[model samples]
Target chain A: NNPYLFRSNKFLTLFKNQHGSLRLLQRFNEDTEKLENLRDYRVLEYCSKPNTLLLPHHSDSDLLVLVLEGQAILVLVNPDGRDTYKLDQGDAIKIQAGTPFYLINPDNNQNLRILKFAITFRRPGTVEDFFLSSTKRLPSYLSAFSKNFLEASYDSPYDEIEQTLLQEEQEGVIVKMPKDTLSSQDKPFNLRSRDPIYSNNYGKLYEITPEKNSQLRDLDILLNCLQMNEGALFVPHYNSRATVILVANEGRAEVELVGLEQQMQLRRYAATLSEGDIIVIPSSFPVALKAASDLNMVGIGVNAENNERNFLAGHKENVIRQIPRQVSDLTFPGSGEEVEELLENQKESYFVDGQPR
Target chain B: NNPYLFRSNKFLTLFKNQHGSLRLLQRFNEDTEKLENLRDYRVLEYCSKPNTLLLPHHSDSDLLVLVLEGQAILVLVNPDGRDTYKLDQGDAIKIQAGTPFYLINPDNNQNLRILKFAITFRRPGTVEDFFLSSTKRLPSYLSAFSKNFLEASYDSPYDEIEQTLLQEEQEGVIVKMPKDTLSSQDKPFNLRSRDPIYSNNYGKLYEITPEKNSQLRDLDILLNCLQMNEGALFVPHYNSRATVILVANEGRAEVELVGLEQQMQLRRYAATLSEGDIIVIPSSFPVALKAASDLNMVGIGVNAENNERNFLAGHKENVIRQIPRQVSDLTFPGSGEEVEELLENQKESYFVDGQPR
Candidate 1:
């Protein structure tokens, strides 16, 4: 049941059973009609369960997510783009129209809830696609997302410089590279960050963990909201419009919005964001996400331009080959599973500087 | 011969010799040493003339006339126990050491020459007693002089005021005094003028007319080099002191020294001056006279204070008359010619307006 499509029918009949989900028998459009420019929004609900892949797909409208309830690890496969960021609750990111992204829940128990919003210009189409997990691992799906977006004549977020850095990394069948090689994340970061989406070397994200606590501070004007159920995740994507994620309520969450030049955060009032405040994302930059937490958490996004779009496609090749070669037998396409199984094909984990085998 | 005794000596000699008729000596006291002080003096010689009064009277010093080459009309009277001011050429006034006074020349055709100076104070006598005419005639004089002194005894230059206003004319005088009775000179007739013996007002005199056609102005400092003769008049009395008188030189003059309130004087350019220019008889005050067009006429007097008796008496009278009269003249007893004769004697003159007579 879509909220925007069914909310307009005035003569619609709605009934509620003990389960608390809606049971509608009749409906009609009413006094307040749905805005043609602002419907078709959905949330990224993938990061609540471990090893699971979630695709939040939209075409005509922009989509946003805030991971408020869980801690999850996410991987972005540009094969040709720079990617690095680890975030928690109050963290937010964006996916532009026509750009595919995925979110994953590495947390095993807590439910993940994210608030999301959509901005659309005119056309209605393209159902928001979803997947429980990628059918492949990180290495092979990088080329897979590239083939889906680049072959069909679409622009993705990968710039030439980030693409060159991606090519220089040691290649593996699964592309399970160390995160430190992608960026310098060790800089002394600004602590008391609060201002929304000011420019920095890379891009911006919402805060998470006990660190930000932003839901209690003043929330600047809200533009849109998106929320999802537990045990779901999303993959990497570019933003249709810039956005900030506000962590309204969360319990032990991890969230991330990743890009290069990882430092010099576009953040102000770094120390104290509580329950009600927001983080901002620039309109044109690409972003991806993962979330982990317990309480149903919400994410809100505001944009400079109201009409925006988002795309959806998953990297099934990498999830099967490089993520975990033997932990689960994950393959092409997706499975409607609470837990994902892939990366079983790449089993020879090499040592780097004598640290691992 | 003692110059102090030579007023008598000049008188006896002029009487015995019967010197040239209409003979004249023009300037008097050409020497500064002879007059500005009470010491160091000169004398006139008259050894050949007759039938004249040798009456001696004093005001501030003795009298003398050298009789350089002439005989003069001589008269001295002490009428009413005062030395009145009235005399002619070859005749002279003897101002006894302490008396404050003046002289007159009533001669017909002679220029009386007399050398004069003081015998007590080295400088000119105190100006306090002569303030009446000066202050009133030129109110500016009062501005520069002391009011207390201007109101003191022997202080009225009243007769000179009358004389000056006369020549200044009814127009000028009446303009200054709309209600002045004496300025009218309309007093009740008296058959006798104050006696030359008893009246000190007619205390002394001399006649002076220039021998040649030397033009005269009034009240100039006269020198012997401008003289018709080497010695026509020289005076030393009161222990070689000299008393003052007027003499005309050449041209016409009507000069005057105005003094304290309500007084003035008038006479020809050659007449003996009581007050005018360097001839300021603050001792005599308010005097007016004439001088030569070329021969600067002068008034002369004696220096008698070299003798202690003279300085003491002269100073005593000055203090008595000046200092006390500074308090109030109508109640002060230090007598002067105008104060005694006009102010104290006649009641009607001042009473109409209650001013000093």
Candidate 2:
């Protein structure tokens, strides 16, 4: 019930078709006072049939779309005509506001699943979608103009303009597309497995940053996908940089967040998150997570280009371990040497094995 | 020469009159790869003589305006017709993208000075100004549409439309206005001095947060103003939550930033800043500032709604001092007890007395 924990059932379907559908979570500020300040963020989940197309459209706000499963193609219309990108699992792209674009599920054997988050400025918390096609249910923006304006601009009869530019796509926004209907003309980057920043016997983590993908530079956002082996625990740490919106992709996990209360004491919040659940962790709030299943995968969106992970305890890079020994000796309930033993016993920096509590 | 450090001399004047002037800084990405990812921020400095009006216009990007000197009257045009705000030194307001607005310097004895920072999404780094009044040198956006279309929409002849909407004002955008031209019809909040977050013999700080001001909730931004008494030093700390863009409003200071470089070594950057200087500090980087003058004041803009100030040393709420005593004993250069004495000696949590090093 806390502001940070959003249950999957709270999502409302924005649009639905047999081939694909879009669902949006309730606005964060409306949930509780704890998130009342966050009025610029909106998150939506999308899934499409193995071979489908999300009709060409433009958004009122900027977006960062991350692919969670299958493969797809994104075509962005620009001054130079169009820029087509081939995106797959873990791939993310920055969609500039008002840029005409469309998506296609090109892989015939698997469904395309993705998560889209908006960093809106034009109208905060409103990610309105404007479609270019004029189906019986959807009207084209061009048609909104008067008959004379359209006729004068196109130098044609009003009836002729209606039959041509205003023609409807009977199949709706997300329709099935042929397997070979899409291809990338220009290369776009994704979070590759070859260069994950962290890897160990317990889990693996891959990051997508401006340093790794130029497309993300202008948007000032980042993405990361982490997977932990069964019963593995990621040590308590804080992203000293950006606020994060994380969604679980596979299995389940137990997560804990530590925040500062008014008295300078800690406010502990713990939750068990299952598939499709979303959680918001503000920057500087310490958090730890342990996988509750055989494998747990979660994709996160951070609202900044720079990033840092400061873990609370463990060996090598543990912030607590780096404190002055005598100072720690006085602050902790044990002697300096004993505190050293407790912190040093952990063999890894980020991940370690954990048993059920 | 680094992308992070923008020199004051590189600013270009956008417009100037005897009554006022506006200048913009060079784009950060244009400077170096160090900031090659920062294509969304644009900063501009504006100063107006008393009784001047920064003619009615709207911008192509969202802006966070900080008042540094004098008082201003900002009239924002909305669906409800109008909303006016009275701003004084240290106050900040969020200007939504493409919102029709204008500013007037109502004070008779002092110059009105302000800093404007834009977060652009439509065309990153390009904060194009669109003036409403057409002058001999300037053009109104309404004039860009075809005459026939304008005539049809207004239900009047092209000549009438031209004279009514495209009329030119000879004096240009920074012209002077009468003293009694502005009166606020609605109450807007400002950063008041009553609730100083921290106050000492050394310096004082006031903050503007979304929680305190409803207008700021949708922008996901925050403002803070600090004035240090002569020869005071602020402890080394990091904004664990948001990236900061700081501008010096008066006097001078020596600032240092410690960052993590490649290979896990610390990279230190220090600079001496004076009036009109602008510096960027990434989130999570440790920074300290020593005021070198009688009254050094600076205003800062942070990109996140949530905020945290984490100090590296000292007593009371100091993070390192609160660490497990034994852990500190092992990590610091001295014994835990010795570290205790050094950290505990600081009587204040943030501001302390400092001499020239």
Candidate 3:
């Protein structure tokens, strides 16, 4: 009955070029099916050499890309136009199905490693890559266009158009680039040091939703980056609209779950995790997480579509803050000022660092 | 959005009689509605004096009862017959909706403390206690039976039947008893110390499910009691059927969650939990838990209905053990003998104790 933990060695390389490689852990297969309890989801791990470029391409699945190492510049093209984002090792960007996008590793010597959690829109684990440029193995998008139409559109002869488009030198999903293609000053602010959207004495949360980018059309997923100080907590909370799946990039943590139903023997679940372990927080379950004392922890959450979080404790944004001061005082047998002091003292909204209680 | 977490003092006692009291943080109302992201579930806390009996009653909700303190004898009756459970602190018992059951505080001097997580079946935060005995504020089942029916059932005159049956001294849901009423000898062998159902070098698991008891009709919930030694892990694993919820009963722990998706910023959701924190593990997500140094940790799990766990890393119940030795060796680039040694060394199934890796 052992299943659900996929080792690194098990990843199957799906695509590789001189500049980078793409590996995948298929959602459904003979081995993965053994995890009889897991929902169907696939993982793609990508690595790219510095000064490399991935030509424009569109996929059949929605992509949520996590940068695991180094930095990259992602260019997404939609109906409105093109938008560029500079992503560090801890930043994430979501791209919806059919949205053409390309990535570039700007550093001269570093390698960029990215992990893609693709939600299948067409097939379970099969993704069709439709590239616009020619590669060693596949012809360019020009092959699909009529020779006469392309010739007229480019104001050139058919043979010239064919030679320039179909016989181009660019090959594979990734291509090597010359030095000094893009500079760090071009995309300056790093997400890691930015102020969080909301925070309290326990931890800080940074949120990104589809509203932030039009390219994330119909992919209502929300991304959150959380940081908790050593021995600090992400106070008890729940999200009504989204099931939250999380990963730990750094440090060790403990997570606890309290659900809706009554359990016969075990009333709740609690576990400890190191780096790379994954957990899913079901929609609306009360949950809390804390970081071990040795180091602070950084956690990333992939929330279900249109997700919103409601916290249960902290100096602000907790349930107690919404209640009438008199009612709160009577229920807890505390003075009104004491209740206010506990609920309204801190003005922080998202990212915070503080001493343990 | 500060909501979902309810402080200790915010809980409102729903019912209180001579024998015990029931308190609830209402599922949803004016104040609770501030938790816009929470699901429709409520928690109930109960406490009973020593040598007291909670009279026979059934509710419109399924009940998962966790014993916080003291000892009690739980009698669950079904169409088949009756099942009795002796419960101590950290033990839990589940009762299905409409199942008539009662709890007895068998200890002579200790107060019984229980926390109930109730899944609403008919109403939100409103549980009707259909008692078979009289209480200070409610009528007994006798009130529903006619005088003639009661007399015939007892084979006596109406006055005698009413005087004897309706005039019993048990006046409420909870009734205090005299000394020597119930003894420890009545129930032998503690569930806490019994050989665990499954164990490994990391931890131990004690499980109870509806299939294990005849009286738990129509209920499919599974309960697991987990104990991990200081700095020990519960291994990496996932449940195929159940979305698990957990609570830490003792000590501190660390939990990590790794789902199928890639997280760039926070690679996994890792947290630390002191006692009393709760968390939910969504169905099929890979997870692991560890005990903090200085003390072992005890955790309780409330499994989704029809739950089964499949482990990922262990001596016996891990992925490598299921595959052929040669295949495992080649896949991992190790010697076949080395693979065999790692996969076949231990025979333990559920509970385990081992040194750190």
- Model 1 CA deviation exceeding 4 Å by range: A1-37, A40-47, A55-61, A125-127, A130-192, A195-357, B1-357
Q: Looking at candidate 2, what is the lDDT of residue B6?
A: 64
lDDT of 3 by residue, B3-22 (tens): 22233455586567767887
Task: Supply DockQ values for each candidate.
Answer: 0.00, 0.01, 0.01
TM-score of decoy 1: 0.20
Minimal lDDT window, size 10, model 2 chain A: A178-187
lDDT of 1: 0.27
TM-score list, all predictions: 0.20, 0.51, 0.39
Better of 1 and 3 by lDDT: 3
| Per-residue accuracy of model 1 over B2-80 as CA lDDT, tens digit each | 1111112122221122222211121223322223342233323222223222211122222333232234333222211
State how far residue B5 of model 1 sits from its true place (Å): 99
Please state the interface RMSD for every predicted structure, separated by commas: 67.6, 30.2, 22.3
Residue A97's lDDT within candidate 1 is 51
Expressed as tens digits, the lDDT of each residue in A2-114 for candidate 2 is: 56988888889877888888998899887577775467778888999887778766665667887888898887754224566889787776676656577888886899998
Off by over 4 Å in 3: A1-12, A16-18, A25-43, A66-69, A77-85, A88-96, A115-119, A124-126, A132-172, A179-202, A209-218, A257-275, A293-357, B1-357
Q: Model 1 over residues A188-212: C-alpha lDDT tens digits?
A: 1221135532122122232222223
Better of 1 and 2 by lDDT: 2
- Order by TM-score, highest first: 2, 3, 1
Pick by lDDT: which candidate is best? 2
